[PDB]
Amino acid sequence: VNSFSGYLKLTDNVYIKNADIVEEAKKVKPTVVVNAANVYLKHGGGVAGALNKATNNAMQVESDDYIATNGPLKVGGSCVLSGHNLAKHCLHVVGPNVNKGEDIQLLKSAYENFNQHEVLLAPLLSAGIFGADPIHSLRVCVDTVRTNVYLAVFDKNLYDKLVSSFL
Numbered sequence: 001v002n003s004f005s006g007y008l009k010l011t012d013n014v015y016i017k018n019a020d021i022v023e024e025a026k027k028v029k030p031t032v033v034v035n036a037a038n039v040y041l042k043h044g045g046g047v048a049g050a051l052n053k054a055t056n057n058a059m060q061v062e063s064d065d066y067i068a069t070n071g072p073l074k075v076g077g078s079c080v081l082s083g084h085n086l087a088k089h090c091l092h093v094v095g096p097n098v099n100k101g102e103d104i105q106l107l108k109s110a111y112e113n114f115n116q117h118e119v120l121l122a123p124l125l126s127a128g129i130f131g132a133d134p135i136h137s138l139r140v141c142v143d144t145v146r147t148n149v150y151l152a153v154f155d156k157n158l159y160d161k162l163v164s165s166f167l
């Protein structure tokens, strides 16, 4: 039993809700919140910009030190950093950005990072400003993630479309 509330159950391990991931993280304080990161951990907009804003820029400060030490992530890769006031940990995951020409096949590799964590609060990878079809992202999530994932979808219209079209 966990504290996630109001989710629709899609499969044995995947759950979904129309919610602002920032507000959901502040309420649940999950062990892991997933960020929709880029390779530079520049949290400018989309989910990343919103999460970073909620940390009063502490996420960005920590991320800049991470990059200075380690260099950029790979597309499809991830790193674990602090969750600050939102979660115990933040798993920064880089899905391919279609608006940069990146290979959509890398979306499966991106979701594989979730399997290293038993339970996660997450957005749909490569959705929103990353330019992929969120219906496809949900399909890849369900077919790749085996651990327990709670998906927050900000847009109500999109949430209803994802549910109504789910096979």
Ligand SMILES: O=C(O)C1(c2ccc(Cl)c(Br)c2)CC1
Binding pocket: 036, 045, 046, 047, 048, 123, 124, 125, 126, 127, 128, 129, 130, 134, 152, 153, 154, 155, 158
């Ligand atoms: O939750 C949402 O509405 C969606 C999303 C996902 C990731 C990012 Cl980065 C942004 Br922006 C938006 C899925 C469309």
